[PDB]
Every structure is written in structure tokens, then in C-alpha cells.
């Protein structure tokens, strides 16, 4: 009980410190800038090769190649500009909830309900992509996986823990042990020195890879967080919950900055991503269509309607030139 | 064809070849009937896996009368059921094992099992997915109801302690948790360590789901 009292006192201290700095809302500051978000994005390409619900996708660094994963059991590596399939990687477990594409372009990764983050070698002397490693240390389903290098990967798993790996050894050089519910999301800040995870206890945490600690915690939502994503500074990030309200927390000031809700939308937010500026914020809903939120002034500044089922994944190219959304109708679309 | 380099054209040829192999593998994958096995009767579920003659999901491919079932055992997945349950939005049928003899072992196991059935029978995902229902562990339920009364779990039950009345009662307040009585069908079956009656039953109740899915797909129903 005494430890509970100490925890309550520390929580009170944290809430007081949070209120102390909360001088003004971001909306007030941005009230004096031009609302210029009125945009229309036309489906520039449709990538149709998957035969089941696409659960994840990732972009290559060049903003030309993208990997996608689906319950089809396949992991296709696409060419955006030509809608070509460079590779199709047959997995040993159809239940895949994630995929990653290395910043070097050499490897991909693919996790899921089988608890193994497998890793595939694309550049090899034979002509085939072969499973270079299978990382096996989680107890629950893997939800997100992000490459840091060609040698270390970070993954988040339904066992409430995230763990940076070391692919050659096969071991976890670190496990982050803070959350209380499932962890469903992951993003890497551009310097890759830190990363944030959004768990189903309706919280997000600011990890730190080299240390393994947990520095910050953001608790604004009223339900689980199904997708998280940084602002390109690596200074703020946006979490999409299942209470239909994605939010823009910032690493500094420890606190929410804005909520992106409109009474018209009530479905949960499946994906969240920014655009190279950051002035634009996409989103992805269970209600079959994206949005486009004027990140600096919450306003549904356009709609990427056009998907026949839930959008499960969303990624803006590295150069910013296009946004690709996947969806349980098994089509990825490019919206320049 | 025009405006395409030699390599820029051989790349397209490779893409078309890849697409051929995706179609082939998708057909071969769709051939398999995908059952989902889940039930709080861990001993019951392992025994059921045992009659079905062949760390996360545990697929159990078996084959009967030319169907290619593919039973997924998820109970090793100890997490929030809400978050991965939609992966199985398209399973042909859910198998559900509950031990009959555990009606008075602890909240008694029967009540936990029926809460689980009620939850997994009314997801927004399984609104058209027929639920097969095995009531295994029958033989020892016989003796254990010979000794103990069924009121240990159900205070409101008022009837003889004969095996038949108790069994029909158990089937009654499982099959009555089905809110959507017009779409889903809750196939039920009492089983023990007995013969291939069990796989016969699953085949019988997966054929009747293939029929209904075909009628729905043909717009005819």
C-alpha cells in the first residue's frame, strides 16, 4: 500500500509538471497561419497482386520499391513507378501482421502470430530470397518490426514487450519491459537512437535503444493505439487509436498537442503517417477511406476515399512524392 | 511494347511470371478448409487434436474424404483476443471444445467456458461463421454427475440427475447464447475417446458450411 501511495504521489508530481508547462494550445498558435490544406489526391497507381487482406507495407529508401505483407502468405516487393513485382517471398506462416524493408534495401522482415520475426536476404549470389534468420524470443504475436541497420531490428509483440535484436547472433541485445497490454505499433525516430511504441493499454512510451530504458509516457487516448508514427523532426509523433481520434503528441513537453477528431467519423484509426513537410497528416480508418488532416490545424482537408475495405497500412514515400495505402481488399494504391 | 528498354521489358516478363506463381499458390492455398480451434478445455482441445489424426499458432493439416482441412490451434497465443481475432475473419468454421466434466471446478469452469462461447459467438467478425461444438470428456461426466448434482454449477437447473437431462441442459445454454439465430448455426456433438465419429462430425458440419457459402456467393441466398 505504501508503494501505491508513493506511485500516486509520483503520478501527481508528473501531472503537476505537465500542467505547469501547458501555457497555450497549439491550435491557438496556429490560428494565425493560412489554412491551405484543401487538397485532392488522385489514385495514381493501383498495385494488385495480393489475394487476401494486406496487413502491412513498407517503403524502400529510394521511394521506388515497397514491400507488402498479407494473409496470402506472401511478401511481395513492388516497383512503384511501373507496378512491377521484383520479388515474391513465400513465408512459413500465413499469419503476418507486419513487414519491414531495410534502409539499405538488402533485407526484409516479416512477423506475425507465430512469434518469429523472420528475416530474408534479397541480394544473394543465387537468384532466390532465402530466410537468412528467424528471430525467436517473443511469446506473443509480433505487431511491428523496424530495421535499424542491416544487423539489428526492433520488434513489438503481443507479449507486452519490445526487443531490439542482433540478426547474426539471433539474440535480443535488449528487451523493453514497460507496457501492460499488447504492443501494436512502432516507429523509429530519424536518428534511430530512440523509438516509440503504442500499446493497447491506451498508452505510448518513448523507448531508447542503446539504453533500454523508458523515458516518456503519453496517456491521452481512451482505447488501444493501433498505429503510431513520428513527425519527421523526430520531435513529435502521431498515434492513431481505435476511439477514432488520432493525436499528435510531442517528445518535448511530455504532453498532447492536438487531437484529430470529427463527430462524423467514429471508426477506429488503423494507420497514421505524415508527409515530408509535416504540415499534412494522413490517416487511415476502418470506415474504408483515409483522411487528410491539416496537422497544424486539425481540419479534414481532403479525403482519400477509394478503398473497398478497411485501410490497414499507409506509407508516405521517403522523398514525399506519393502516399501508398493498403487495405483489406488486397489492393495498395498510390495517391500522388 | 514501345518505349520499353530491353531490361525494362524483361523486368515486366519477370513480373508476369511472378503473377503466374501467385495465382497458382493462391489456388492451392484456397483449397484448404481453414478451421479455427479454440476452447478453454485445454485437455479437451489436446485430446481433440489427438483424434484428428494428422510457440504461437499450431496449424494441424489433416485430410478426410478429400477435403484438406487446416485446423489452427491458437490457445498457446495468450494475449488480448480482440487484436488478432480478426485475422481469422474468413475461417470456414470455428471448433469449440469444452470439457463436460468440468461443470463444477474453478468461478466454475463451465461458466468461464460459456462466457468464452458467448464472446466468440458474437464478434462482429464471426457473424456468418458456423461454430462446431464438441462437448468432450463425456465418459467421466457420467460418473461425476452420478455422484454430484448439476445444481453445483446451475442453481436454476431443476431436473433429474440422469446423464441425458444434464447433457441436454448443457447443450441448451450453450446453443442459446447464439444471438443471431438466423445466420449462424451451432453444430453440437457429444464426444469421448471413441472412434472416427468425431472427424465424421467435423466433415459433416463443414460440408454444410461450404454449401451455404456457395449459395451466398452465387447471390442465391
Amino acid at each position, epitope marked *: 500500500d505504501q508503494l501505491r501511495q508513493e506511485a500516486e504521489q509520483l503520478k501527481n508530481q508528473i501531472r503537476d509538471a505537465r500542467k505547469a508547462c501547458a501555457d497555450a494550445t497549439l491550435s491557438q498558435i496556429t490560428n494565425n497561419i493560412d489554412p491551405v490544406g484543401r487538397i485532392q489526391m488522385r489514385t495514381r497507381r493501383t498495385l494488385r497482386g495480393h489475394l487476401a487482406k494486406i496487413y502491412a507495407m513498407h517503403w524502400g529508401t529510394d521511394s521506388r520499391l515497397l514491400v507488402s505483407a498479407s494473409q496470402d502468405g506472401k511478401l511481395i516487393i513492388w516497383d512503384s513507378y511501373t507496378t512491377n513485382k521484383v520479388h515474391a517471398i513465400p513465408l512459413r506462416s500465413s499469419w503476418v501482421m507486419t513487414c519491414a524493408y531495410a534502409p539499405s534495401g538488402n533485407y526484409v522482415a516479416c512477423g506475425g502470430l507465430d512469434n518469429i520475426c523472420s528475416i530474408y536476404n534479397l541480394k544473394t549470389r543465387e537468384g532466390n530470397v532465402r530466410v537468412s534468420r528467424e528471430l525467436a524470443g517473443h511469446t506473443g504475436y509480433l505487431s511491428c518490426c523496424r530495421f535499424l541497420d542491416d544487423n539489428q531490428i526492433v520488434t513489438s509483440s503481443g507479449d507486452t514487450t519490445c526487443a531490439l535484436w542482433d540478426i547474426q547472433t539471433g539474440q535480443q541485445t535488449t528487451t523493453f519491459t514497460g507496457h501492460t497490454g499488447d504492443v501494436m505499433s512502432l516507429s523509429l525516430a530519424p536518428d534511430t537512437r530512440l523509438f516509440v511504441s503504442g500499446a493497447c493499454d491506451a498508452s505510448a512510451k518513448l523507448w531508447d535503444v542503446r539504453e533500454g530504458m523508458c523515458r516518456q509516457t503519453f496517456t491521452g487516448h481512451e482505447s488501444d493505439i493501433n498505429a503510431i508514427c513520428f513527425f519527421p523532426n523526430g520531435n513529435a509523433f502521431a498515434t492513431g487509436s481505435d476511439d477514432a481520434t488520432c493525436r499528435l503528441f510531442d517528445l518535448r513537453a511530455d504532453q498532447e498537442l492536438m487531437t484529430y477528431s470529427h463527430d462524423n467519423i467514429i471508426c477506429g484509426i488503423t494507420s497514421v503517417s505524415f508527409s515530408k513537410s509535416g504540415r499534412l497528416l494522413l490517416a487511415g480508418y476502418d470506415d474504408f477511406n483515409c483522411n487528410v488532416w491539416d496537422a497544424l490545424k486539425a481540419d479534414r482537408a481532403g479525403v482519400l476515399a477509394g478503398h473497398d475495405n478497411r485501410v490497414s497500412c499507409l506509407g508516405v514515400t521517403d522523398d514525399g512524392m506519393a502516399v501508398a495505402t493498403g487495405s483489406w481488399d488486397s489492393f495498395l494504391k498510390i495517391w500522388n | 511494347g514501345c518505349t520499353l528498354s530491353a*531490361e525494362d521489358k524483361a523486368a515486366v*516478363e*519477370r513480373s508476369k511470371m511472378i503473377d503466374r506463381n501467385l495465382r497458382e499458390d493462391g489456388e492451392k492455398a484456397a483449397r484448404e478448409v481453414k478451421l479455427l480451434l479454440l476452447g478453454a478445455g485445454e485437455s479437451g482441445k489436446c485430446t481433440i487434436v489427438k483424434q484428428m489424426k494428422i510457440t504461437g499458432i499450431v496449424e494441424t493439416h489433416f485430410t478426410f474424404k478429400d477435403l484438406h482441412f487446416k485446423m489452427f490451434d491458437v490457445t498457446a497465443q495468450r494475449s488480448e483476443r480482440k487484436k488478432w481475432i480478426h485475422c481469422f475473419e474468413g475461417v470456414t468454421a470455428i471448433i469449440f471444445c469444452v470439457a463436460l466434466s468440468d461443470y463444477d471446478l474453478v468461478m466454475n469452469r463451465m461458466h468461464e467456458s460459456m462466457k468464452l462461447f458467448d464472446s466468440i459467438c458474437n464478434n462482429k467478425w464471426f457473424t456468418d461463421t458456423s461454430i462446431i461444438l464438441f462437448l468432450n470428456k463425456k465418459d467421466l461426466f457420467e460418473e461425476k454427475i452420478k455422484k454430484s448434482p448439476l445444481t453445483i454449477c446451475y442453481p436454476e437447473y431443476a431436473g433429474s440427475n440422469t446423464y441425458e437431462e444434464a447433457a441436454a441442459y448443457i447443450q441448451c445454454q450453450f446453443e442459446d447464447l447464439n444471438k443471431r439465430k438466423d445466420t449462424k448455426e451451432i453444430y453440437t456433438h457429444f464426444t469421448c475417446s471413441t472412434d472416427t465419429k468425431n472427424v465424421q462430425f467435423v466433415f459433416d458440419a463443414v460440408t454444410d458450411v461450404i454449401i451455404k457459402n456457395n449459395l451466398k456467393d452465387c447471390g442465391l441466398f
Partner: single-chain antibody
Amino acid sequence: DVQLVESGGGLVQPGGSRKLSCSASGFAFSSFGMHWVRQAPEKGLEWVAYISSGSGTIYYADTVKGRFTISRDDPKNTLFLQMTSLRSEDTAMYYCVRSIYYYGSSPFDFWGQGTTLTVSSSDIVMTQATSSVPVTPGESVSISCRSSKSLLHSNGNTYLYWFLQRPGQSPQLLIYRMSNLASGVPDRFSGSGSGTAFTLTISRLEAEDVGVYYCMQHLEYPLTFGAGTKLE
């Protein structure tokens, strides 16, 4: 261990026929598009025939259409060239060269040992003049190859390849699409240029780089080679 071994060499009377066979090993032979590149007794490389992955596409040199036929045996990993009516211009050493085409691939990357053959007695022209230059170890040399037609497609990629032929070995691919230093090749090499003007740049040249260097155009079939520039 990605060896390719060609068999079917010997002496053939003119007007005869012969089966050439290349046995693959150590690679996913069914996923590759294999070539045949001959080489006259003391002359440069010369493209012969190409068969795609899945055998959908088959091209031929203008000098062998009808006379030659290329086929692959995918389940057993062996590539077959059927030669009919062997004139005296076919006496040459025939090579087995694999090539896989996707976005960012490395075609012509592995060259087989190559079988020898003897017979008893609109196309883009790539000019690689200055066939021989003396070489001082520790120096830097640049080889020049020129194209009749602009090798810069609209896609933005200039289809130029650079092959080194070691003395009495199989050529190793050096540079693909005019800039990308192919894998397994030391950094000191470099390629550059624009359409119809090319240059292979070597830095700190040392031994075991002597040989004859060739260029390829790969916009349009038939692929054509330069006459080959020699180092000594």
C-alpha cells in the same frame, strides 16, 4: 560455388551439327535468363543467343538465326545450344553467361568456363578503338568506348556494361548500366559518361588487371560488343 560448365567441344566438319550443353550448379537456374557469347580464336566477344526465365523470350544474333537454337532444361539445370550447318565462321569458344532482369539487378554477372569449338576449313555499332595501351603498375588508366546510337533511354538509365577478360579465363562483369560497380569487383574501378560517350576509370592499377576489356550495349538486341581494349 556458382560454377557453370560447358560441354560439347571438339572438331566438327563443315555442314555438320553439334549439341552444346551448359550444366548449372549452385544457383536458382530456373530464375535466370541465360546467354551464349562466343569468341572467335583471336577476336572479341560476340553475342549468340539469349533465352529468358521461363523460356518466354528467345533472341538471336543476325548471323546465326535458323542455324542455331537455344533451349534450357530447368528441372536438371542445363542449358543447350543446338548448332546446325556449322560454317567456318563459327569456330570459337562459346560461353555460358547468366543474367536476371528486375529493377536493380546485375545481368551478365557470371561467366562460365566456356567450351571450345573448331571447324576444319540497324544494329548498334560499338567502337572501342585503341585496342592496346601499355600499363604501368600503380597508375590509373581510362578505357574509351563509343556508341553509334544514344544509349540513354527515356527511363534515365544508360545501358552500358563493361567486361574484363582475364588472360585465358572467363570475363568478369565490371560495371552495369554505365555506373554501378557490380558485386565482387574491387572499388578502384569506375564507370562514367553519357549517351554515345563512355569511359571506364581505374585507380591505382596493379597486376591481375591485365586482359582485354569489352563494352556492351543493352538497349536493343542483338547485344553488340566493342572490339576489346587490351592491357599489358
